[PDB]
RNA sequence: AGAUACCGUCGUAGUUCCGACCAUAAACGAUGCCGACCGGCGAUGCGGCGGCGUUAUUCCCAUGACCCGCCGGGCAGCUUCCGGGAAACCAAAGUCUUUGGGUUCCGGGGGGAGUAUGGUUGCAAAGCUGAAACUUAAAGGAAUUGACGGAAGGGCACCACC
């Protein structure tokens, strides 16, 4: 039976979209199909930002971030708990969880 | 493309009856539609219409009552003999009390009742009950 | 460990519905009230019921309760039925009017009233939250 | 209804929607005969007579019942022709 | 209600609609509420036509006067703003109030203690009081509904276009209606301006109760 | 049917004729491969010479020897 | 057996004040009291159990065998009710379905095949009724035909008082509940069908709630 | 058997049938 | 255990380009095309039309960038007792026993079988066309309830842990 109206992707009037390699695997997944995360992240978490500002050459040097876009296959995204099985109603909720 | 102007009109008034609209617009007018509509009106399944006259295939605004159960076409136009008309009205009309097969005879477009009196069959147009 | 069961709470909310007037904050009276106004086969259950009666009596004297109805709420149904304030906020002489709220009144017989105040309309036709 | 004798033989004649002319079924439970009270022309008070409209449930769940009382009222000059 | 100067929109009546702001509709518009609007403002607020507001409240009042036994016109409001206005209207008109928490099956289920079986509903908001509209379907109940431009007209049989969001505009549209149903019965006279005050029907914010206490100390 | 036109008798008939072969009860009867394989050759009954007596095992649910004859 | 009526509509029936259930059917009033039909059509009303259909829900340790009883009811002149009740014991299902049938009873319209002499015998038009895949179609038939139908929808049309009827069923009619309902939805849509006889504009007579508003205040709380 | 591998068995067996029928012509 | 597998290190044809062949995919929206009609809403892409005001070329005019609509086609989305459907779901899968707008292709229980055979296309691989004997009482669809999971969560317990 049909589980998702979009067939679990986001091509509508295309026919073909270029496959990307998964970051965890290297499974060739269509760009629209892939679970995508744009994680903006500090080069140090919380345990080192205290230690580096103290031992800086520069006063008022904001510690720069690390910009990585993560592409996932569905088997990597669910196994690493990025996405998650939802109830048949809750599936349709396209609002990203805050 | 549009290959039965009568069929695309009878359905248009039928969808409006199913919905409960008080009057319906039917974009292409033919003498065949007007003659079909006038036959429904003399039996009183529609209120008075008016053909809007452009320098083209005119339009019609039919004032709908809520008397019309279904208005349906027969395509193609099966030629009907009087000995075969009873078999048509067996399996096209609900009861032998009400409902009318109109069919285009030589004596003009008219219901099967008027087409019986004149003892003259012809090509079936559609029906309404 | 001490949660009242429905048997205690139903007996409580019906005793305070009916015999409200006899009851009050004091436990030891409305312990002994239950001996006259019910047939309870247990001493332990009598105290449970009478205990949650006093807990509801401190609630009822403070405000309305979800699962109760008495004649003092019927009296305060009548009290707040007669809150007559100082003259209302509708009997004003300056009621602010948009040019377009004037246009629809101009079409009516109420063209210009002496006690209206027409303003200039808000420039920047800008009334939607952006998407995301 | 009639036979050859002419006598009405069926056991009840159903009502018929005042908006769309469609007869109201024996179990159309969303049907509503509503009395619009008649006001005295010069007093502005209730006469004792009513302007009765029956609307079938297929209109109410379509969202067209309060447009069609508004038309049935203005057809009977309850609502102003100006409106 | 039409061509009758006795049921004319009185000169006092407009300035109450303008003060309370019952003309002042929603941001977006329902397709069946398009007939109750003059114009859309620059700064997208839909101006409700107060003439066509008045013509419906008169039609709604006729619906309630036409009910002989006044008890069984069950009056309903779930939101903050109407709970007071309905309990006033029920005593004022002689109707039955349901102010806050309409239990599902109070019209359908026989064995419920609150098996009310009315002849007419009056509703503060379709989108808020959506529940009694779906039992107004199951038992042969005509609906009256105080409606707004962004509100849907599903199952509602006579609808008054209002600002049923606004604080005072709810109570005012109840006050206007409580009066008119009495005027037509012949309790109130159309000569004398009515004793009962429109402020009586307004929802009192418990924040303003603790502030009015120290202002009137 | 699909093609309704007043002058469409040869397609409706030839379609019905072509698609009748996809019926099992038809193609079995109207190709003589069934009749060529039928040991009776279309006969209701037939006579034959008994040449041994076979004890046929029944199907799994019903375990018993069905005493048949090779004719 | 006293029966103190719960509903407003029920009270009028017990006081012999609303005197025909055609006055109930006219105003589309839901009949929630069972002992209204036991009053009007009471002893004229025949019970035949169509079927006992044992249903099962798989639980942790075995199946819970509930019994679905289908009762068709009706006096052999104007009224039928198809009631179904799923109980745990078989006797309760029958008693439950008899009650649920009576609540569900409809008036069947009956007309004439062609010539219009005597008392009516057949369906007034070509009604259809379908639930599930089962499409049931009833057709008017001449006097003395009997019901040309399957034994079960025949069993309802006999109860309805339709003496003559051609039928043409379609779909999985071996599943009875669908076939019993589908035929019931056909003889529910007889009075719902707008024939030119029913073109005379409605003269809206007074509702029994409005007629007896003087009595529905004082005979109870 | 996967319908694809069922199909691949036929295309190896059809391939050997053609082989034998070339040897006899 | 085996591991001619998954994992790892290498690596042939291939992957790239030019020119010919092949004609198949879950080539899927598993949904033929043309036309008519039947609810709502907010978006979006494109063109056009009109309408306060901000901004740029500032020095205006006309133009871009926003903003508020309207219209036409377009990919879509949500919404509902239009209606349909076995249901899942579908404004199309609706307008269907109240059965006919036009037309094309194609199905007839499951296997045997896309097999054998013949024809045909191709260098080959194979493509197109395509049986029968025989076998079999089911195969299958949707949904429900349980049970199970080397799925995800939320509990409880000194017959669990700390």
Numbering used by the authors:
A (entry chain b): 2 to 99
B (entry chain X): 2 to 130
C (entry chain S): 2 to 133
D (entry chain W): 1 to 83
E (entry chain B): 2 to 218
F (entry chain Y): 2 to 72
G (entry chain D): 58 to 278
H (entry chain An): 1 to 25
Excerpt from the publication:
Colony collapse disorder (CCD) is a multi‐faceted syndrome decimating bee populations worldwide, and a group of viruses of the widely distributed Dicistroviridae family have been identified as a causing agent of CCD. This family of viruses employs non‐coding RNA sequences, called internal ribosomal entry sites (IRESs), to precisely exploit the host machinery for viral protein production. The IAPV‐IRES found in the intergenic region of the IAPV virus belongs to the well‐characterized type IV family of viral IRESs. IRES sequences from this group dispense with all canonical initiation factors and are able to assemble by themselves an elongation competent ribosome, successfully redirecting the cellular machinery for viral protein production by an RNA‐only mechanism. Using cryo‐EM, we comprehensively characterized how the intergenic IRES of IAPV, a virus of the Dicistrovirideae family and a causing agent of the colony collapse disorder (CCD), binds and manipulates ribosomes to redirect them toward the production of viral proteins.
The binary IAPV‐IRES/80S complex populates three major conformations, with limited differences between them. The majority of particles populated a class where the 40S subunit exhibits a small degree of intersubunit rotation (approx. 1°) compared with the unrotated, canonical configuration. No major swiveling or tilt of the 40S head is visible in this conformation. Class 1 is unrotated, while classes 2 and 3 exhibit a small rotational movement of the 40S. The IAPV‐IRES maintains a similar global conformation as in the binary complex with 40S, but in the 80S map, both the L1.1 region and the tip of the SL‐III show good density as their dynamics are restricted by specific contacts with elements of the 60S: The L1 stalk stabilizes the L1.1 region and the A site finger and the ribosomal protein uL16 the SL‐III. The SL‐III of IAPV‐IRES contacts the A site finger, stabilizing it in a fixed conformation, which allows the apical loop of SL‐III to reach deep into the 60S, establishing a novel interaction with the ribosomal protein uL16. The IAPV‐IRES positions the apical loop of SL‐III (nucleotides 6,585–6,590) in direct contact with basic residues of uL16, which are in electrostatic interacting distance with negatively charged phosphates of the RNA backbone of the IRES. The additional anchoring points to the ribosome contributed by SL‐III, allows the IAPV‐IRES, in the context of an 80S interaction, to be stabilized in a conformation that overlaps with the space occupied by a hybrid A/P‐tRNA. The coaxial unit SL‐III/ASL‐like domain of the IAPV‐IRES functionally mimics an A/P‐tRNA priming the 80S for eEF2 recruitment, effectively bypassing the initiation stage.
